[PDB]
Amino acid sequence: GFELKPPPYPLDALEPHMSRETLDYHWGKHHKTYVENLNKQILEEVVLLSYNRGNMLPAFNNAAQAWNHEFFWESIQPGGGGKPSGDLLRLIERDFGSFSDFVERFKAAAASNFGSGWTWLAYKANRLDVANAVNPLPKEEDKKLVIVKTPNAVNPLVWDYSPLLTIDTWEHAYYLDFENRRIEYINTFMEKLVSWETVSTRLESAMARAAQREQ
Amino acid sequence: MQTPLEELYNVKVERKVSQRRLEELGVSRWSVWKTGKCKLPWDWQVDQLVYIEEGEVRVVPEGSKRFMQFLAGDLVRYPKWLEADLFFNAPYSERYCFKAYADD
Amino acid sequence: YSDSEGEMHWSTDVSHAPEFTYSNVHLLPKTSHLWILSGGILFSIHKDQDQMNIPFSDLLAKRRRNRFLIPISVEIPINGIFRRNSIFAFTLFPKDLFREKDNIQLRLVLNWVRAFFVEVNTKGLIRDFIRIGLRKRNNPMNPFYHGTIRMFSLLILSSSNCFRIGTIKNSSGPLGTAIQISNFYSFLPLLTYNQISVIKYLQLDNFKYIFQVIHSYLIDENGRIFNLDPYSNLVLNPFKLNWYFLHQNYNTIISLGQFFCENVCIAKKEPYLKSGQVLIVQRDSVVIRSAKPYLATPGAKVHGHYREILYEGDT
Amino acid sequence: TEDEARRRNWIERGWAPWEEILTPEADFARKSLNEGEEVPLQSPEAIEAFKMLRPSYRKKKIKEMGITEDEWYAKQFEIRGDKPPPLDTSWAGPLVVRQIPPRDWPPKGWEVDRKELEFIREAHKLMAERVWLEDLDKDLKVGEDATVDKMCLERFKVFLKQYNEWVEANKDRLEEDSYKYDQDFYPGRRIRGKDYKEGMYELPFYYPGMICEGTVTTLHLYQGAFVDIGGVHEGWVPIKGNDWFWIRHFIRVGMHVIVEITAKRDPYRFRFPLELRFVHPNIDHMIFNKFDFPPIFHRDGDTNPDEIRRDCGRPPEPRKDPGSKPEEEGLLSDHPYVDKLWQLHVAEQMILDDYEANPPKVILKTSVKELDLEAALIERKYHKLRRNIEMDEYDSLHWRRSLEEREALLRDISSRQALGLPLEEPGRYKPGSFFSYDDA
Amino acid sequence: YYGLKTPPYPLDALEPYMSQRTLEVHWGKHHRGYVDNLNKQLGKDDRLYGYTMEELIKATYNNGNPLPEFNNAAQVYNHDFFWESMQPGGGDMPIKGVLEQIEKDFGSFTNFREKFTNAALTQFGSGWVWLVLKREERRLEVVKTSNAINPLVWDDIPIINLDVWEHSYYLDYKNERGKYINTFLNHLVSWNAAMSRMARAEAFVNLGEPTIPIA
Numbered sequence A: 001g002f003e004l005k006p007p008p009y010p011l012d013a014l015e016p017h018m019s020r021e022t023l024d025y026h027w028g029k030h031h032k033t034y035v036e037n038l039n040k041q042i043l044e045e046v047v048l049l050s051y052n053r054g055n056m057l058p059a060f061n062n063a064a065q066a067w068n069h070e071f072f073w074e075s076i077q078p079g080g081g082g083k084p085s086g087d088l089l090r091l092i093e094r095d096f097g098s099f100s101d102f103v104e105r106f107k108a109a110a111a112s113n114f115g116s117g118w119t120w121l122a123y124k125a126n127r128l129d130v131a132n133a134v135n136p137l138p139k140e141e142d143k144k145l146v147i148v149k150t151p152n153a154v155n156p157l158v159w160d161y162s163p164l165l166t167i168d169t170w171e172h173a174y175y176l177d178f179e180n181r182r183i184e185y186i187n188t189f190m191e192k193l194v195s196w197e198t199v200s201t202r203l204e205s206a207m208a209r210a211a212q213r214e215q
Numbered sequence B: 001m002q003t004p005l006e007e008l009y010n011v012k013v014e015r016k017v018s019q020r021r022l023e024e025l026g027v028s029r030w031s032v033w034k035t036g037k038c039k040l041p042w043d044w045q046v047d048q049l050v051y052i053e054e055g056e057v058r059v060v061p062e063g064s065k066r067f068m069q070f071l072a073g074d075l076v077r078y079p080k081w082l083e084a085d086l087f088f089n090a091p092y093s094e095r096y097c098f099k100a101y102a103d104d
Numbered sequence C: 001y002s003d004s005e006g007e008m009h010w011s012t013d014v015s016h017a018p019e020f021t022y023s024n025v026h027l028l029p030k031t032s033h034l035w036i037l038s039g040g041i042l043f044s045i046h047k048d049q050d051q052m053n054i055p056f057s058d059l060l061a062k063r064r065r066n067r068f069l070i071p072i073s074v075e076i077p078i079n080g081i082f083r084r085n086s087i088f089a090f091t092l093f094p095k096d097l098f099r100e101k102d103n104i105q106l107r108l109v110l111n112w113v114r115a116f117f118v119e120v121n122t123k124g125l126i127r128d129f130i131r132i133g134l135r136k137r138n139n140p141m142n143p144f145y146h147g148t149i150r151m152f153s154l155l156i157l158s159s160s161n162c163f164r165i166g167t168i169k170n171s172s173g174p175l176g177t178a179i180q181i182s183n184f185y186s187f188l189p190l191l192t193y194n195q196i197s198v199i200k201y202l203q204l205d206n207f208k209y210i211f212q213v214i215h216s217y218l219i220d221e222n223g224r225i226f227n228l229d230p231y232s233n234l235v236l237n238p239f240k241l242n243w244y245f246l247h248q249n250y251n252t253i254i255s256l257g258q259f260f261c262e263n264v265c266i267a268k269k270e271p272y273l274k275s276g277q278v279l280i281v282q283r284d285s286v287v288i289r290s291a292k293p294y295l296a297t298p299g300a301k302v303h304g305h306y307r308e309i310l311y312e313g314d315t
Numbered sequence D: 001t002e003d004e005a006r007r008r009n010w011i012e013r014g015w016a017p018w019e020e021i022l023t024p025e026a027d028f029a030r031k032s033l034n035e036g037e038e039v040p041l042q043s044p045e046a047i048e049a050f051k052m053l054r055p056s057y058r059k060k061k062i063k064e065m066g067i068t069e070d071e072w073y074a075k076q077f078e079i080r081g082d083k084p085p086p087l088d089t090s091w092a093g094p095l096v097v098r099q100i101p102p103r104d105w106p107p108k109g110w111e112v113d114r115k116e117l118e119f120i121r122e123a124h125k126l127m128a129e130r131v132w133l134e135d136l137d138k139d140l141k142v143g144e145d146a147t148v149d150k151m152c153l154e155r156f157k158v159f160l161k162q163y164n165e166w167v168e169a170n171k172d173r174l175e176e177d178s179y180k181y182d183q184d185f186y187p188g189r190r191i192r193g194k195d196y197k198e199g200m201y202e203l204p205f206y207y208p209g210m211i212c213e214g215t216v217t218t219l220h221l222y223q224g225a226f227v228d229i230g231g232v233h234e235g236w237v238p239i240k241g242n243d244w245f246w247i248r249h250f251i252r253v254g255m256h257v258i259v260e261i262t263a264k265r266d267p268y269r270f271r272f273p274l275e276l277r278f279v280h281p282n283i284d285h286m287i288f289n290k291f292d293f294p295p296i297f298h299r300d301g302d303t304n305p306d307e308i309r310r311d312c313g314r315p316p317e318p319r320k321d322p323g324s325k326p327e328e329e330g331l332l333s334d335h336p337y338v339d340k341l342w343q344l345h346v347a348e349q350m351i352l353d354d355y356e357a358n359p360p361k362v363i364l365k366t367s368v369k370e371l372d373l374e375a376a377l378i379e380r381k382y383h384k385l386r387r388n389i390e391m392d393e394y395d396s397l398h399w400r401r402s403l404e405e406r407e408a409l410l411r412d413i414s415s416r417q418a419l420g421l422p423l424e425e426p427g428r429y430k431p432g433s434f435f436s437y438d439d440a
Numbered sequence E: 001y002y003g004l005k006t007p008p009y010p011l012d013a014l015e016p017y018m019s020q021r022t023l024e025v026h027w028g029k030h031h032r033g034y035v036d037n038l039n040k041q042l043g044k045d046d047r048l049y050g051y052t053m054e055e056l057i058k059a060t061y062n063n064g065n066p067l068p069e070f071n072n073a074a075q076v077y078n079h080d081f082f083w084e085s086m087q088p089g090g091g092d093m094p095i096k097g098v099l100e101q102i103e104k105d106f107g108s109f110t111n112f113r114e115k116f117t118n119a120a121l122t123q124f125g126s127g128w129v130w131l132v133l134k135r136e137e138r139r140l141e142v143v144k145t146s147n148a149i150n151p152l153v154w155d156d157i158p159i160i161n162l163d164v165w166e167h168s169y170y171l172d173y174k175n176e177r178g179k180y181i182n183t184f185l186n187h188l189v190s191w192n193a194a195m196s197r198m199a200r201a202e203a204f205v206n207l208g209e210p211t212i213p214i215a
C-alpha cells in the first residue's frame, strides 16, 4: 500500500511562480488519483515489473506517474533557481560545455516535447541485459549526463538510467498559471523553482550506485 | 526509374553543411566511426545522423542496381527500417548519432 | 475440354448453387451456353489492371562470427563437410578484445560447416590458410566497379485475346475549384445528392437549398460574389477569362458487356461480328475480348464455379 | 438455396446476366433442346425459332412489321430484363467556385520567379474563408457589374503568365517523352501527333477539387469511364465489373457530364493520371467494386520491386516473421574492414620473412603499395602485433556504433509503445498461414 | 499554405458547456499556433506544398515514422474537424441514416454511447476519440488515437471528433474529463455535421446493398 506523500514545502510556498490552485489540483487530484488507482491494482520495483520490457502491464501508468510526481515535487523548492556547484557543475560543463549551454538545451528539449511527457536530466550508467554488452576497457567518460524526453508516464528508470531532475510538461502542470505559454513555465522552472541541492544529492547516490556495480 | 533513390527512400541529405549547423547539432561531441575499402550491410533500426569528415560512401539499397553517393562535408540522415549495403573504396571517416522518436 | 485457357462465364440457365456443398459442379436445368473468356507474381506490386511492359603463429589466425582461419594437425573429412560434433584438430586465435555470439562453438571438436583453402599472395610469396565457417546486418554488384493484369488468380489480357471492331464558345474544361459551403458542414463540398443519399443524409434546415438545376457563383480574390445571369448556366473559362454557357443546365447500338456469337450481324453493310464480350465501347469502334461458347443440354454438369480459371485441356 | 448462391456469385465472383446476342441457329438450339431429342416441336418459341432458320422468312416477317432490316439488326442488340430506377440528381445548393492556382505549381525542375510565386500562393489561404448560403445575396454582382474586368483575379493571372511560359518551353519535350515511353495511345496517355491541338490543358493546369465539364469518350468494362475535360490527358472515373450492368443505362459515350478531380498523379508511373468522380449524374449509390490501388506501369527500368512500391503507395513485399525481438539480440562488433586488415597483416609478415631468409581454393592478391613495411620492419627487428592492435580498435569503433543504436532503440521502443506507434515496418512480417576452448 | 478557419459559430455560442475563454485559447492560440507552424514548414518544401491536406497527413505520417511536419499538419485538420463536430443546441440523438447506421453497427445508440465514453475515458494522455467509417469493412467504429494521430493515416473516414487533450477541458472541468465527455454527448455533438460527412463518405464506401436481378 503506497501512500501519497505531501510536497516538502507548504502548498502556498511556491507562490507566485506556482499557485496554490495548481498544487491543489496537481497534487490533491492528479497525484492522489494515481496513488489511489495503483493501490487497487496491487515503487521503483513496481515500475520496472509493470513496464515488462515494453509490453506495459495495466499498473505501469499509475505506478510510473506516482513515482514521477513524487520525483517532481522534490525537484523544486520555494527558493530555487540559480546555479549548481560541486561535482554536478563539473559534470555539466564536461558534458554540455558550460552551464549556460546546458540550460538552453534543457529548455529546448522541454519546449519541443510534443503532447504529455517529461524532460529529464539523467546520469547514464546503464547496463544492458544482452550478450556482448560489456566494455572490456571503460573510459570513465561513458558515465555522462544526458537530456532525455519521455512521453506520457515513461521515465528513464525503464532503461536503467539514474534520473536527477525532471519537469512535468503535462498541460495540467501549468495550464492554470500560464495557459498555452509553456515557454514561460519552463523559464520560470529553471530560474525560480529548480532545487540544485536536491539534484546534487541525487547525483551522489547515482555515482555510488555505479561505484557499487563496478566492485 | 526516373525518381532518384534519395527521394524514394527518404534519405535526407544536406550537402555542404555550414559550420553553424554543425554546432547547432553538437557534431563535435558525436562518436567517430571510420573504415577502409570494405562493404557493410546494415538494416537501420533507428534513424541515424551521419556527418562525413573524409572519403565517400556509395549506398546500395536492398535489391537495387543504383547507388546513392555521399561525399565529405555532407550530413546524411539514414531513415529507420532502411536496408542497404554501404560500399567504401578508400579511407573514410564520419561522426554519427542515432535518433529515437522525437529527439532530433 | 477447354480449347484455351480462360475464365468461365454463364449468363442464365445454370444453377448458382453447387450440386453438393463441397463440390464445384453446377447443374443445368435448361439448355445454355457456357463461355470461356480468353486470357493469358509478387502480390504487392502486381495488382488489377496494371500494364506490364516487361516480362515477369596464432597471430596470423583469425576468429570471426561463425568462422575462423588457421595458417596441432588439422584433419578435414574427405568431402570437406563437417557434421555436428566432429573432430577437426587433435591458443589458436589472437584472443580479440570483442567476441560476438556465434552459433558455432569449439570444444578440438566443431559443434553448433564447410572448409576450404585461403591463400594470400604478394610478390611471388604464398601463405596458405584453412577457413572453417558456418536481418540485413547478419549477412556474412559493387557500385565502384506486353499485357494487362486481370486479378480477382491472374490472367493476362493483350492483343492475343482482345481486338478492335471498326460570351465565348463552350468548350470542355475546368470551371474552378468548388469551395466549402458552411451550411453543408463538409470541407470538400457535397455538390450533388443521389436518390438514396438525399433521403438518408439531408438535414431539415437544408431542404430549402436543394435545387433541380445548377446555379453558378464566382468568388473573386477580394471576396465579391458574381453571377452575371442568375437564371441561366454561365461559368467562367479559367484559361481565357471569359463567360460562357454550359451545355445542358443539368436538370449506341452495341452495349457494354454484351456477348456475341460468331456470325451475328449488326448491319447489312457491315462485316459479321466475332464471338466474345464487349470490353471497350467508343464513339465509332468496339474492342472485343475473345470468347468461345459451348452448348450444354439439361442434366449436364459444369466443372467449376463462376469466373473459375480453366487451363487448356481441362474438363 | 438458389437465392443466396446467386447473390454470392454477384458479390463475391462478379456474376452478371449479360445479354447473349445469338444467331438464329444458336437461338433454335437452346429453344429446341429443352423439349427432347427427336420430337415434334410444340412450344411456340421453338416453332418460331424453327421458322427463323431461313433468312427469307425473317425478311417476310420484317416487312410485315413495317421496319427496315437494319432496324431489326439493331433491335437484337437491346438490353433485356428490367431497368434500374431512373436517376434523380439533386444539387446541394449552388455551385460556388474560385479561380485558385494549383498548389503543386510549378513542376519539379522548373524555375520561376519566387516573388511572383509567393504572390500566387497567397490565394491558397482563401480556402479557409467561410461562405454561407444565407449570404450569397447581399452584394451579388450581376449583368454589367459581373463583367470579367470587374473581378479581382490578379493572383490567378500571374499563374497563367507562368503557366504559358512553361507550356511554350516544355511542349515539345513532353511529346517526345510520350513517344519514347508509350508505344501506343490509350485513354489516359498524352494526346500526340495529329490528334493534338494547341490550347489543350497540360497536367499542371489541373488540381484536385476542380470542377470540370466534359464528355464521356470511352467505356471500359474493367477500368471505368474516360472523360475529355479539355486536357492533353483524359480523365478517368473508376468503374468495373458488375457495376456496369446497371450503370451502362446512364453513363453513355458522348454525353456531357460534370466531374470533380479527386487525384492527380504522375503519368510515367500511373496509367490514369487524372482520377475523377461523376458529380452530375450522381452514381455513388451504384458503385460497389472499388480499386484497392490505382493501376501502374511496370516499365523497363523497374527492376527492384521495393523501389516500385515506393514510387506508388503500395505495401512492401511481406515476409515471414523472424519470431525474435531485435532489441534482445547480441551486439555486433566485427568491423567489416578487419578482414582487409588481416590480409595486409599476413602480406607484411610473409614479406618480412623473405627479407630475413634471402636478404575449393580462394586466392587473395595483395599489393605491396598498400602495406606499411617501414613500421613492420622496426617491429620485426624489435622482437600481439600492431596490426592485431589495429584490428581491435576498429572492432571497438564498430562495437560502440552497435551499442549506441541499441540504446536509442530501447528508448524508441518505450516511446512507440506509449504512443501506439508501430515497432516494425507496417506491411512487413505477415503472420503464419499467410504464405570448451574458451575456458581451456 | 493554409488559413485559420473560424469555427462555424461565434466563440461564445457554446456557453455554458464550453466557455468563451476556452474557445479563445483553444482556437485563438493552440489552433492558430498549429497553422502558423505548418505554414513555415510548407514554405521550405515545395514537394510537401502541393499535397492536399489529406495527402499531406498521409505522406508525413510516413507509414509509422512521422516526418517533422506531421504533428502540425495533423493537428490543423483535427481542430478544424473538431469545431465542425460541435454546434449550439447539439447533443441528444441522431436521426435518419446516421441513427440507422449506428443501430446497425453498434446494436443501439446506447451501445455506441458507452463505447464512445469508454474510449474517451481510457485514452491516456493527450489524444482524440473518433467515430469513423471503415473503408474496407463498410461500417462505423469507435477509435481512440494518441497525440495528433487521426484515422486518415489508415484510409478511414472520420465522422465525429472529440478532443481529449487537457487544454480542451481543463479550464471548465479541471481533472473531471468524464463530465466533459458527458457534456459533449448531451449538449454539443453535432449530428447534423455527421449527416453530411456520411453523405460525403458515401461517395467512396457505399454502405447500401446492390440490386441483384432474379434472372
Ligand SMILES: [Fe+3]
Pocket: A026, A030, A069, A168, A170, A172, A173
Ligand atoms: Fe502531472
Ligand SMILES: [Fe+3]
Pocket: E026, E030, E079, E163, E165, E167, E168
Ligand atoms: Fe486541441
